[PDB]
């Protein structure tokens, strides 16, 4: 039977699903690790033990225990990101969408969801692999991993919570795809991993980490890179936050064993209720438990790794959205509202800068303010709003990704850069938010192809172009069709630095994506903060 | 007789001179102080002793001993600024141009020449007061003062070279105009002092210095203000340079008396041959002997004086030229040439920045470079040239003058700001230099009215407009005609910050003259250099 597959872990029974008035196979909730419950909490994942009989993979699995956004109850705009399944510590499963008839050895794409390392699910509607699997004829895999304290608590030195166990979760899932995807029709030597936000940062971390390098061929990074100021911390800050977490739940803090044991006796929702109380600064776009430079998963510091060429050399495709920061200002900076134009005063602009660059001294806050203010129109509320918006995006997503791409391209075997600047017509968020963080995803998974969702005809055309780029790149290492007549997505080179805009208009090639600001955030500010 | 005048110092015999096919009286070389020779060198000026008989004031006086530019022998462009008379330490005289018939009590204008405090003469062709005296019907006075070491050597604490004796020279001349201009038809209670470069800085210093405040009514400052980074030094740096000057001429340095006496036995040309060897840094737009904050001429520091409103409150008219820096880059920065487009490479751009902001640490040099570089076109030789040009002008003339005008307007009784951006058609300097430092002067003195000099018809029209502005302002405190139908030069206010462009096109009002950069040079950089 086409829905029956025999893997090295046991037999699996999938289910047939309808897609664009046709059908494909889906194997949902296949386990790749033992349930990390009880004494296993905070610990590294263990391989799932083989099972007898047939595993029923016809329904989605549970979602990892996580913080749930309730800033706008009912609002589809925000709930479409919340977990749509029972949350549980027993969350390590993966989903596979296979074309029909089953391929013999086709291209594989493994998706890693984002969520600031504190949230995210593989079962969201936006992440439905069937449209893409169907339209491009590839085996689509989406894995899951532990987030929040459950996946990133770090007490370096002990083996009960070494840290980065959330990244080890992903590596585990990748190891399974490597050892079993062949039985689903996929080609293990042609797997592209791709992600967004924290997922984009994760993809960049497997490219850097020696233990993960051999498990995939190519990589796609969307709005996120490993060297982002929010994606990692030192073992010291990791330890400092683990302790404070324990202090918030009144735990015996005499020793790591003391602390860990107390944290293991706690109910999931208790660690989550106080998780945000451990951040060192009053800030925006920063998260409690994230990856930590431990000397294992990451040999040395990320910057020296990028400078020494110590990382997997292959082809990569990456880019960012036009308005990456608006989402965090809405939820955290004073002055912004979901229901108003949110024109910001000088007062709130500067409060926003303090919140966006939390680690900067007064001299630094002054440098940032000067760099993003038009003194010929300093009280223009719309200019201060977009100025604040640019700051959060540049400092957190764009300038860090341009540093990675420029360092990578020096040792890589091919780079393709995009800039997504199209605001979907059916967006429910206000206009002042623009091309929002995470909304390029819907085009990548092809939601515009389904009429009932209500996208324009040009938006569906865009979705197919992007789906063909990602897929054609996953198969060949080049987003372009060999002898096509269409426009060519030029290659990014250390010299020319070309990139393309991605919208519903005739393709246009550009150069030096936001250089002015990137030089400020990557060369000047770091230096200033260090000398002072 | 109309050419005979009896002053409180003695009788003076002037001469009739032709101007625009007419005539006016001229009293040239009237002395206002005793010849500062011999033992009087470096000492404060003494009032000229009355004389019997008639003083012959029909020919220009000598020029103060000074450095003479020989960078372009023959070149009119540079020689028109060199002394056109025998140089001599006996240089303290003043020139008066009186309308004919002699007025009874008309407006007086006293001109103070510029020259970086190391050069300058009242007898240059460009400074001929007859055209202005004639055209606007005002008594025009041009004084002289000692420059270089002769007028600014400062050994604070001693009375043999207290410092600022060059400013005391000007004050002396002003005291004479105050006590005698009435006998020439001028009104002593309506004297406007006005100057350019070092002269503009001098005018601003009489506005600040308690001893000079009562000697004039209004002031006009062109391309220069008291708080310019090149116009003054501390008593310590003044002392440090006086000593080094003495070290260069092998003088006994055991005591001030030792040093001063040795410097007095030296021939004028000997102090001038080594004058430039005392600058602390390799620099551009910096001069050896300039005014010094001594606690006498200047009560406290200039910044606290401007902040406390401690200065003469009256009306002032000031402005700057579009390309104030090009002249110093040509003579001192590597890459620039009088005979080429001078496109600058990245190498020379940065060498230029090091030369322009001599007192900045590496972090500061980086801030400046970042603020003036277009990273989307960093190797564009024309952009690096104009970028360097903007830096020198902004840091040395424009941003400092905007700080003064903004501080003054808070306690003043009226401010009028201009931006001169018209390049004369007969300029002999290359085009890349633009609207050069000191070339608005020719329009102020009305040289465009004399056909033989070869100016366009619109240039002569501009010269009359400007001459009427300066003169109408000198008489009333407002550059505009009471019930005129012409365009109005708006008043500059702390709130609106309006200013006008001054060229051959229909007047246009603007706001916040170069705010972006002015905030950088006045608020951020100072702060950065102080914290680091």
Curated annotation (Swiss-Prot), chains A, B:
Q: How does it assemble?
A: Isoform H form is a homodimer; the asymmetric form is a disulfide-bonded oligomer composed of a collagenic subunit (Q) and a variable number of T catalytic subunits.
UniProt lists the family membership as follows:
Belongs to the type-B carboxylesterase/lipase family.
Gene behind this protein: ache
Chain's role: Terminates signal transduction at the neuromuscular junction by rapid hydrolysis of the acetylcholine released into the synaptic cleft. May be involved in cell-cell interactions.
* Native source organism of the sequence: Tetronarce californica (Pacific electric ray)
**Could you describe the post-translational modifications of this protein?**
An interchain disulfide bond is present in what becomes position 593 of the T isoform.
User: For this protein, what is any one GO molecular function term?
Assistant: acetylcholinesterase activity
Q: Which reaction does it catalyse?
A: acetylcholine + H2O = choline + acetate + H(+)
Does the keyword section mention Signal?
yes
What general EC class does the enzyme of this chain belong to? hydrolase
| Identification of the protein by name | Acetylcholinesterase
